[PDB]
Amino acid sequence: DDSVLKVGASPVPHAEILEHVKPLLEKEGVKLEVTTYTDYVLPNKALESGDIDANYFQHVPFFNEAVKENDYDFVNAGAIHLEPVGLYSKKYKSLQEIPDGSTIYVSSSVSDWPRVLTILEDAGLITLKEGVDRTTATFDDIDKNTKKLKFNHESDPAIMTTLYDNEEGAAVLINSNFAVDQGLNPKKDAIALEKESSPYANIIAVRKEDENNENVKKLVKVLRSKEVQDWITKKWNGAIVPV
Ligand code: MET
Ligand SMILES: [Cl-]
C-alpha cells in the first residue's frame, strides 16, 4: 500500500485541513490517513518510529530544537500556514492594565519564548539587552521590565487553555491550534497578538529518506494551492494565515 500516506496532525486546524484535502489527494491517486495527536511530542516520536510517514503540527524553530535534542533524522518538506500567537486573559482587556509583579504564563516550549517577548516589547513593557541573540531570546535577555512581570514557563503547551480558563495569572500565551479548538478566536479574543509571525510557519515534516517521496510532494502542493489557501482563510477568518 505505497499509495497510502499516514499523516500525524494537531486537531485544529491541521487535521481539519487534511480531511478537507482528502478528495483532492484521492483524485491524484494518494490515500491520506490521518492520526490526530493532542500534544507536541508524540507526532515527532511517531514520525521517527515509522508509525506515520509525515507530520503537520510544528514550526521551524520548534522543529530545529526537536531535531537537535532528539537526534531526529527529519527534513522540512515545506511551509503551509502561520498562527499569529495571542496573549489571553479573563481579567484584563489590555496588557497596559496589568498590576506590577503579576505573572504571565507561557508553556515550557522554549521556541515560543521569543514570541511573548516581541508582544511585550511592541506593547512598550520590556526592552532586551544589547547583544541579545533575538533568534533564541529568553526571559534572561530582558533589560527593562516596566511592570516588573514574572514569567512562569513550567506548563505543557497542551494545558495553556486550562490556565486561561481557571484565571491563573494576568495573561496566558496559548498556541492558536489549542485556542481555536477551545473556541477562542485569536483575532477577536486575544488582548495582544504577535505582529510578525513569518518565522513560525507550520510545516510538513518527514524522514530524510522520504525527502523526495512523490506522495509527500503531492500533499505539499495541494496544501499550498490557491483554492485550499483561500479556504483556510475563510474557515478561520484570518486567524490561520496561509503561506
Ligand atoms: C509544535 S510548535 C507550535 C505550533 C502551533 N500550531 C503554532 O504555530 O503556534
Ligand atoms: Cl517552504
| Structural domain boundaries in the chain | 1-85+195-243, 86-194
241-242, strands of its sheet edge to edge = 31-36, 4-9, 54-59, 202-207, 74-82, 241-242
Give how far Cα 170 sits from Cα of 68, 101, 106, 107, 149, Å. Answer: 34, 10, 11, 15, 9
Query: How many Cα atoms within 13 Å fall on the side-chain side of residue 208?
Result: 5
CATH code, 1-85+195-243 = 3.40.190.10
Nearest-CA residue for atom 2 of ligand 1: 58
For the CA of 223, the nearest ligand? 2
Nearest-CA residue for atom 8 of ligand 1: 83
CA 1 / ligand 1 centre spacing (Å): 31
103-107, strands of its sheet edge to edge = 150-155, 103-107, 171-174, 86-88, 192-193
Q: Which atom of ligand 1 is nearest to the CA of 61?
A: 2
CA 62 / ligand 1 centre spacing (Å): 8
C-alpha cell at 41: 511530542
Instruction: Kindly list the protein residues that place their beta carbon closer than 5 angstroms to ligand 2, a single-atom ion.
Output: 78-79
C-alpha cell at 149: 512581570
Superfamily (CATH H level) for 86-194? Periplasmic binding protein-like II (3.40.190.10)
Nearest-CA residue for atom 1 of ligand 1: 58
C-alpha cell at 148: 516588573
Same fold, 1-85+195-243 and 86-194: yes
Q: Does residue 94 sit in helix, strand or coil?
A: coil
CA 76 / ligand 2 centre spacing (Å): 8
Distance of CA 201 to the CA centre of its chain: 8
How was this one solved?
A: X-ray
Torsion angle defined by CA atoms of residues 90, 10, 239 and 108, in that order, rounded to the nearest 10 degrees = 50
Specify the resolution in Å. Answer: 2.1
- How much of the chain is helix, strand and coil, in % rounded to 5? 45, 25, 30
Nearest-CA residue for atom 6 of ligand 1: 177
